[PDB]
Design a protein around this nucleic acid. Sequence first.
DNA 1: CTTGGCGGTTAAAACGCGGGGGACAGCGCGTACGTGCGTTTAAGCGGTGCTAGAGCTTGCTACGACCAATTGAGCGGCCTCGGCACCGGGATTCTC
DNA 2: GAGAATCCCGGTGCCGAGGCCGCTCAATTGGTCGTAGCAAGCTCTAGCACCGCTTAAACGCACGTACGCGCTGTCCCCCGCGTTTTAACCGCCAAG
Lengths: 95, 95, 65, 59, 79, 82, 107, 104, 31, 95, 97
Amino acid sequence: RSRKESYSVYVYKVLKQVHPDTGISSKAMGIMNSFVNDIFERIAGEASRLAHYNKRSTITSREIQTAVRLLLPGELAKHAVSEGTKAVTKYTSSK
Amino acid sequence: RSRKESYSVYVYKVLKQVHPDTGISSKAMGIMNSFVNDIFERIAGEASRLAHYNKRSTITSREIQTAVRLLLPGELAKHAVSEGTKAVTKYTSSK
Amino acid sequence: TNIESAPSLAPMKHYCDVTGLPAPYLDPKTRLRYHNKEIFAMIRNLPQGMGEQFLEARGAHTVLK
Amino acid sequence: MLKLLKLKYYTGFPGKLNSSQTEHMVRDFCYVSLDYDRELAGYLDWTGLEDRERIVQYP
Amino acid sequence: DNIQGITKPAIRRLARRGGVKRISGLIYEETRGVLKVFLENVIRDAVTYTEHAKRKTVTAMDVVYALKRQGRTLYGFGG
Amino acid sequence: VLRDNIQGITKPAIRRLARRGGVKRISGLIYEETRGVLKVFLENVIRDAVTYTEHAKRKTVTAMDVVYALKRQGRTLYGFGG
Amino acid sequence: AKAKTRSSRAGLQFPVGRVHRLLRKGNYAERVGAGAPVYLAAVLEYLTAEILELAGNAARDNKKTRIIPRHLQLAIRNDEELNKLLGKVTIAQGGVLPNIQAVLLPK
Amino acid sequence: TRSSRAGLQFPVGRVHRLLRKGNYAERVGAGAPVYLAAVLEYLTAEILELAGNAARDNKKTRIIPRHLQLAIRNDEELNKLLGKVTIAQGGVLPNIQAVLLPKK
Amino acid sequence: XXXXXXXXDWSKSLLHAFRYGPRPFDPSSQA
Amino acid sequence: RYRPGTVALREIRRYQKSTELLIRKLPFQRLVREIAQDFKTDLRFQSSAVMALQEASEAYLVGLFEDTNLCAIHAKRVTIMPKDIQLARRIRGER
Amino acid sequence: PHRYRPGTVALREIRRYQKSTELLIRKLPFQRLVREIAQDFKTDLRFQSSAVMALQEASEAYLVGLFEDTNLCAIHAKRVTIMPKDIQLARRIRGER
DNA sequence: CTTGGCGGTTAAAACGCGGGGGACAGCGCGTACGTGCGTTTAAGCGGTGCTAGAGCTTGCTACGACCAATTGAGCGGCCTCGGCACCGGGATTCTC
DNA sequence: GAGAATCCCGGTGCCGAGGCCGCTCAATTGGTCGTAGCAAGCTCTAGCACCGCTTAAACGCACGTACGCGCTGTCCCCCGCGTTTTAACCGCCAAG
């Protein structure tokens, strides 16, 4: 059958978290999926270029953070770095 | 020192091929180098995305050719493609 | 040997870490003890890269790895 | 003391902040207060700050 | 001669969505030309992607890639 | 921290830029506007440049940082590297 | 040995392991750190939330309980930062912002 | 060398090494660096040719960046290729609008 | 406020007293 | 009869609220195939591909019409003329 | 005496500065400006000379590219003098604000 | 290799003023485009048979990473020199 | 026809372009082998063709008024230029 992966269930969970009583259309679902894919490619690309610029062969959380600081503008970037730091800290603690 | 390399000598050779009695300054040489590097990264990048889009893990001369067809506009592409197909032929005539 | 240092278990009086005045409440965004609204203003408009240095001076910075 | 003078003067202080000069500041400008929580909270009041404050030049 | 398929009131409607009150007569032919060039480039790149994939059917992903490489990313069709 | 410096971009300099741009007559309110635009531009570039410098844990902004900033901003610059 | 997901340990919803796999097999670097997938997943999940929130607001405004592309477009084109983020992005079936110039208004 | 076997001046080996690193793909084709170096050599040849002619018009023998700018901007294809590219010490092409010419 | 005052800064904030003291601000002098 | 300008504004308000495609489907398809028949013989098109092409096309045209309208208003006129389109394209860096 | 008609020596300035290739903005105050702007991101920065030169090249290129579109926006409105609204329109169509 | 700082220069930046070319508000001849109704083209509809060809699977096999031996291509570095910036008398060509 | 102000031409001081050389490390030569890629084979989704039909929509056209466009007088604001004020530029040794 060749299963094709997607970010559907995840953006659905997020939707239920922020708006428990709202729905989502299939078109908008695909749009959100393409959105997350695009940003993923952007941040990962910029992180890759960052690693290559400093003669490093490993993309750590630092490269990701700098990439987010370069891509996302202003307060969006601030909250992004905030959530990222919280997540990586909570992951570091809870083994 | 670390032996910082470039495309200096090659640009100089091609320059003396197309124009025997014509020189080049340092700044212009650096600009030509930056040009070569830029086109390299662009073609190789587009070729990488090409290979990735078709679930193929190899950048052959085909991906490079398609990348040139996508990047270089008009005749610049045509001629380039020819100059490629020529080179890769001669390489297969002495290997 | 060299393991005779002992920690504590007691309520600590938490002071400010921008100034030295006694401060009763912290923040969600930057987690800084602060005295009043002037120090809150200077906390919420400080340039980036220093809101972590205050926790570095107090300790438990937890820099990335 | 070096860390708190680095974070107090926040916008950039034009001067070399060595560790040893902060040590000589601590040697002659610090004293353990007797009752700390009362001395501290009314320390930065305007009335009488001119005699609590200790000031240091630079060349 | 399918460029005349894009009719005058269609271009008018597009101008309305663009926020245009009054439209000149020489606008329509210009619009047909611009659309023709745009489609030329995009479809050229798309067919290039198609031929690289050794396919005789240009897919939607080919269009998405073509638009993405021209600096006009399109959401809602994959990628 | 010095004083102003936005006025360092003097009037005849902006006039020169307009001359190279092919401008015959310049308004009076052009200069301040140009100073603003240049300020925003330089801010956007230097921000990313300093970001690249910080990620490399360096205290000196190199030319390559500027080149990378310009390239990722969409204005590739030849004659410095990259 | 009672396995648990890396997303649960990081307190996120977006798949950390999947992101890690994509980074590894995405030709980005030879090696990838352990903080990179959780950080990236966190940023993606945050951005997702910020759009879905405003989209839910725009959906509520049109008396509809299902977010459609139009609501996404209205959400992005009003948020200046989100708009700058998706400036070269065309949202399908999203239309445009209702904006009429003052000169075209009736006398 | 592979450059000599392909009749190219640009280094096939160096291009192959650069394609090996940089994280473009897992494995790299054997004819790929030849083709790529060939394209680079062609483009280099064209620009250096046009800039050589531009240097000839300015009664110079050493090509300055100005000549490179003149060569690139006088070619619609090369200009399109380098649309978002700024050439250092290149200046602008001489262009004065018709309505700016003196009248009355 | 001028009409009210006719009809009728740094000295308020504590951060100037914390960094600089009860004297007025630094005019960016040498000493 | 309304005064000449009211119906126009009503149409602007009408189509700025809608999101469905404006150009007819079949003529656009015929145009797509006519333009495509000069690159590859006997081309087959996915429906989603044509729909994507039309979405991007109409989006591009509307975006251009906004800038064109701005050029028209900048010259103290309420009528878009070819000069405005050419200026917009010129500043955008397409002409 | 010796006067010149307004718009003659300006046109000669256009032809002269379009022929030249040297930088136009004064080096030292521009460098001071750059160092002034950079102090809001990282304290006590050091700069390579090539970095400042790169910033100046990019800035002058950006501005001289913007002044062309501005001039076109001025001519489009049946004028010969550039105005703030022309810069605003240029940067608007350019996609900056 | 970036930064500080003499002090010494002088071209460049500021200030000011006469005034002439241009932005800009007002007006009017005129035509190109809007609005509305009748005629007419064909998009949209769906019905569905035909089958191209995308998609997947298994098998065979030729491609390229990979370790190793090893030599010259290419980078750092030194030096004579000629393109070219500089320089000043005078040809001469736009301008008013 | 006066008056600068570009261009032209012969002369000269200067430094960066170009060629040589020591030599390091990366490109080449050569063989195993896991395996990605070619490729024939095969299921079936999906694209293509099309018969007639209600009708929305494109098209055609007449009437007319808001509007593009040329013309124009007047306030005014940059332009040009001499003088005056100011700091960019330069040499350059030196701390770090």
